[PDB]
């Protein structure tokens, strides 16, 4: 029953989708972090941290 | 459903192992009995106990091999069950992430973050102006000269260090 | 919804790790048994216990690798869940501030 | 076990940086909330005094 | 199209020309 | 291999080709 419902084609497609979705999430995280950092730059000067 | 079958398989394997152990023990006992009977001279009882001992030995070996086979099958089925749970969870995660990334995509997220940054920059400007005004409201209760003098006195008392003109300006204004 | 799937994923990873530990222990026991059987002279029982030991070793390694993979996936999904909460909160904040 | 250790190290560093970013954002939002309360109170005071 | 999409999503299987015909009609 | 090692360690006793077969298959 299971391998009829969840076969190799569907599993492979689902996993490609998982990978692509979390890559997109990797991109979203990077951009979101760039912006989060750009928001607060006068409270954390690079010179002071160095 | 499959978890019940896995449980039954592992139970059967353990039962086979227990039976093999018990049969080995019974063989060890029947060897004592055959020794006794061969001492007493009983040939027929010795034959009976030898048959029993050989049978117990062979059936113990068979039970052991059988339990090994069932153990392999049960390990495989347990792997399959765990991987099925994992696959179901990852399918659910894929569905949820698909819905979300459809609603909250990279375009919308980037625009929302640009908006967040700009709104809080505007708030930075509002805070600065609001603070300028708050300070301008209360300037006769907090004279700059008095604060400077207090800091100088506190420093000089602590021994450490910290890291009039209006008349000249008026004379210059008179020209 | 996704939190439930994350919970199930982490549970499966922990189960795989436990199973790998148990299989390693069973291998250590079957080695004792094969030593005993090779002392008694039983060649067939020694073969059986050797098969069991090798199988337990290999399946323990497989369970360990599998649990590592599921752990990576679950960490990624947990990151995604937390970041989704953060993104939702920041969207709400953006709306209110607007 | 080496793969696991390296992965845990890297993901711990990532979680730490991520938590720092979210901490900055949350501090900014808390400042905004407090200043919004202050601004609302001062608007009410301005109305009453007017 | 709906059947093809539903099949491909389920992973299973199920068990343009007008322009060529018009060009043929032009002769 | 495990049985051979365990035997040799216990000092007792118990009572490659594929390449040659492939070369033979090539004929």
């Amino acid at each position: 029953a299971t391998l009829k419902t969840m076969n190799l084609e569907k599993i492979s497609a689902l996993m490609d989708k998982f990978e692509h979705q979390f890559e997109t999430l990797d991109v979203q995280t990077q951009q979101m972090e760039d912006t989060m950092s750009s928001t607060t730059t006068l409270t954390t000067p690079q010179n002071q941290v160095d | 459903n499959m978890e019940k079958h896995l449980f039954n398989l592992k139970f059967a394997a353990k039962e086979l192992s227990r039976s093999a152990k018990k049969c080995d023990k019974e063989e060890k006992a029947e060897k004592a009995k055959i020794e006794k009977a061969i001492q007493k001279g009983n040939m027929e009882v010795a034959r009976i106990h030898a048959e029993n001992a050989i049978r117990q030995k062979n059936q113990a070996v068979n039970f052991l091999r059988m339990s090994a086979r069932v153990d392999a099958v049960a390990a495989r089925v347990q792997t399959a069950v765990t991987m099925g749970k994992v696959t179901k969870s990852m399918a659910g995660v894929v569905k949820s992430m698909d819905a979300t990334l459809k609603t909250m995509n990279l375009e919308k997220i980037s625009a929302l973050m640009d908006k967040f940054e700009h709104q809080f920059e505007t708030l930075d400007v509002q805070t600065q102006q609001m603070e300028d005004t708050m300070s301008s409201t209360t300037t006769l209760t907090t004279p700059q000269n008095q604060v400077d003098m207090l800091l100088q006195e506190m420093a000089d008392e602590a021994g450490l260090d910290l890291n009039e003109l209006s008349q000249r300006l008026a004379r210059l204004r008179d020209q | 919804n996704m939190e439930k799937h994350l919970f199930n994923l982490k549970f499966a990873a922990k189960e795989l790790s436990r199973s790998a530990k148990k299989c390693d222990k069973e291998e250590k026991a079957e080695k004792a048994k094969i030593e005993k059987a090779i002392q008694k002279g039983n060649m067939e029982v020694a073969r059986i216990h050797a098969e069991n030991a090798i199988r337990q070793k290999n399946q323990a390694v497989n369970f360990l690798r599998m649990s590592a993979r599921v752990d990576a996936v679950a960490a990624r999904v947990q990151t995604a869940v937390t970041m989704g909460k953060v993104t939702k909160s920041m969207a709400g904040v953006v709306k209110s501030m607007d | 076990h080496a793969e696991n250790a390296i992965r845990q190290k890297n993901q711990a560093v990532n979680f730490l940086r991520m938590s720092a970013r979210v901490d900055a954002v949350a501090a900014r939002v808390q400042t905004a909330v407090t200043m919004g309360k202050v601004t609302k109170s001062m608007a009410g005071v301005v109305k009453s005094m007017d | 199209m709906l059947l093809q999409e539903m099949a491909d999503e389920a992973g299973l299987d199920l068990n343009e020309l007008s322009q060529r015909l018009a060009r043929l009609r032009d002769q | 291999m495990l049985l051979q090692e365990m035997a040799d360690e216990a000092g007792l006793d118990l009572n490659e080709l594929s390449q040659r077969l492939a070369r033979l298959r090539d004929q």
């Binding site: 190799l8 084609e9 492979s12 497609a13 | - | - | - | 491909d8 299987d13 | 490659e16 080709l17 594929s18 040659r20 077969l21 492939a22 033979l24 298959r25 004929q27």
Partner: protein, 181 residues
Amino acid sequence: FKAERLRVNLRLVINRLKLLEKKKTELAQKARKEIADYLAAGKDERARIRVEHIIREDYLVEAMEILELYCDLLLARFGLIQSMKELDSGLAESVSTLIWAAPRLQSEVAELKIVADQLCAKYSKEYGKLCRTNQIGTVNDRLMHKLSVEAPPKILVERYLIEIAKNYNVPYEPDSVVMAE
């Protein structure tokens, strides 16, 4: 015809062939031991049947290796499949063999039939089940021999038995009638 379907089925066929050849090598070791045991006794005409089984399985493993090679070749030149409409020379052998061997190994590897479908539904020049079987006269002859359903040569069986006996420390007197002719 669907491209991504063909891609996924090719990857699945590759993985399945890997697993199958592995486990078939293992089973071949075990059954070779069984044939050695058979030769230990006086049973000889039966060990010939067993070794026929063995060499059939070995031909099959070699054919599966070749098919895995060809599937990976198609998978490496997949864009060249999508771009053109008629297959080039570099892909003639792969397509031909994967269409010809699919019904042969359809039971072992199921996805291979889907691969054959996608490769028959994409072409019309001498294509289609009927024309696909008619234009199958360009497949790898070696693979045809590996998957040839025929009684292997007797001398080859004698050589297989000689080697197995010599390895398993068992005496064996080959049939001189075939061993010398």
